[PDB]
Design a protein around this nucleic acid. Structure first.
Lengths: 129, 88
RNA sequence: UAGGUGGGAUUAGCUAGUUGGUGAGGUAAGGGCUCACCAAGGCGACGAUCCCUAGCUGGUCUGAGAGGAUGAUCAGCCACAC
RNA sequence: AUUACUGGGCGUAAAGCGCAUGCAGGUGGUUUGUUAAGUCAGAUGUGAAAGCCCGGGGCUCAACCUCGGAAUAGCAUUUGAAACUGGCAGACUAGAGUACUGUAGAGGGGGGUAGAAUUUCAGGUGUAGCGGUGAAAUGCGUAGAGAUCUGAAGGAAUACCGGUGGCGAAGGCGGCCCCCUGGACAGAUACUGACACUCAGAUGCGAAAGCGUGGGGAGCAAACAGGAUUAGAUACCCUGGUAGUCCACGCCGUAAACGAUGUCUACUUGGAGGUUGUGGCCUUGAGCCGUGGCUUUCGGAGCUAACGCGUUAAGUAGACCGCCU
């Protein structure tokens, strides 16, 4: 069964970037869209779009720079089989601060930088580098 | 094995709505009918191990649907049991 | 009271004051603490029971850390005194 | 990083249970609200002193002694946050399943039957070999073999079709016919509404040999006998030959039970095939083009110690199980 939609999102992006696909579509969800918004903010994707009302699909436009894919790493951290929650003082730095770690805080979903500045910890979704 | 007329008798009897084929009630009732019919076969055909694997999938599936419904509406579950004669 | 605190499943059942109730007694004090009586409970695969090993902790040693190992001296607690 | 939480593995180096079903467990689609158990933030209490660490201070320095801090990653109470996980109450249809109609198939169980052939037997014809091998001998044959014709009786297996075809969870399944029966797949519409995935323990199925009881016994053949070969020949070869092989009902539970590759899910260039559905076109002419299922092969990226694997992954990820050291 598919028991981790988020990891599926990340896989789809990671495999898209690997196959030099322009965009990737997947079944949308709140958290997928939230992730896609952060990834846009941080400049790792080009854009996203949620089409459909009945069964909404998400379309991440992937980003390349010098014909290498912008996303090098897209590691899921908090799996379903092992959740990972870090306090603010214990938030992961990624690629020596040059990558993000997507934290889910109780005031939304943010990069580890913004979480530290906010003095929130939360659930670590993934590392993007 | 259950043909179409016998199915339809059941699908009409246990239907929880209009042209309900898919309620636990219908599904379980059909499986119960299949299982009960097939009991004659395996009395006459004990060595039929391959067909029995298919019998036991029905037995399994019944349980799963019955565990579903009990989880949903215990009262519906209690009805269905009583109407079918299952001691689940 | 709860949580934590070795090893063994080639140790899986264990228990019958046992588990709970009632009353009495008993105690500085709650309490099967004890007895009588009533009931058949209780515990156990989140490892009871049994067997082996062992004083516990603050710490100590090692380790980038996470860990691993350990519990002289000092201090706290426990137990013991042919 | 040699027990790998951090931080390993399992095609061939050690490692995927033979296959499956499935309870507990683990995990679990989308969505609204709520709750606040997990999570996060803060406060308060506590977390002895010593030690460790950071600043000092005092011994000629140092060890040592000592002051202050930090630390004690925890726990309790409490106040907030509500993204994520959980709970609770709903909602949804993509997962999973149901109904309908078809399709292909050595899927299974039961029963019957056909033809070829072997052996035995009976009779006919016939007459000296036959059989076997590297050669030979054992053996068979004048009591008539072998050959040939006819018939009979039995048992077992189904030539051709036949296929890197098909079906099945795996083991496995092959003449034809009937009866009983499982699964898969496709099309179409309707239904249920996460009912799911995986599974410790458990349960079931599980080649061949073997075992029990009762049958059956053509052919084959462990054992065994004899003949050869040889230094020997407890073998290979030859002539025989019993259990077994077959049936019924049990038992056994194992195989290089192999893809030496757990199950489920999603994603990621292609080329050439096979097979089984379905739609369209003009069937304008066997076809061509779509769309599914299953299967074979070659290869790209990637992966891999390499060999190789390569959309049927050994690629990219997730859930769970088994297992290695």
């Amino acid at each position: 069964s598919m028991q981790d939609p988020i990891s599926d999102m990340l896989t789809r992006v990671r495999n898209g970037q690997a196959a030099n696909k322009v965009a990737v579509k997947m079944p949308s969800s709140k958290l997928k869209v939230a992730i896609a918004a952060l990834l846009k903010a941080e400049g790792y994707i080009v854009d996203f779009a949620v089409e459909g009302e009945a069964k909404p699909e998400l379309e991440v436009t992937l980003k390349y720079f010098q014909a290498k894919p912008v996303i090098e790493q897209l590691k899921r951290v908090s799996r379903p089989g092992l959740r990972v929650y870090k306090k603010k003082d214990q938030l992961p730095s990624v690629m020596g601060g040059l990558g993000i770690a997507i934290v889910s805080t109780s005031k939304g979903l943010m990069s580890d930088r913004a979480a530290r500045k906010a003095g929130l910890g939360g659930e670590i979704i993934c590392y993007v580098a | 094995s259950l043909n179409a007329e016998t199915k339809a008798a059941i699908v009409a009897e246990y239907a929880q709505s209009e042209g309900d084929t898919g309620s636990p009630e219908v599904q379980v009732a059909l499986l119960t009918a299949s299982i009960n019919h097939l009991q004659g076969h395996f009395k006459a055909h004990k060595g039929d191990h391959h067909s029995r694997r298919g019998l036991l999938r029905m037995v399994s599936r019944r349980r799963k649907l019955l565990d579903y419904l009990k989880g949903k509406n215990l009262a519906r579950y209690q009805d269905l049991i009583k109407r079918l004669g299952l001691r689940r």
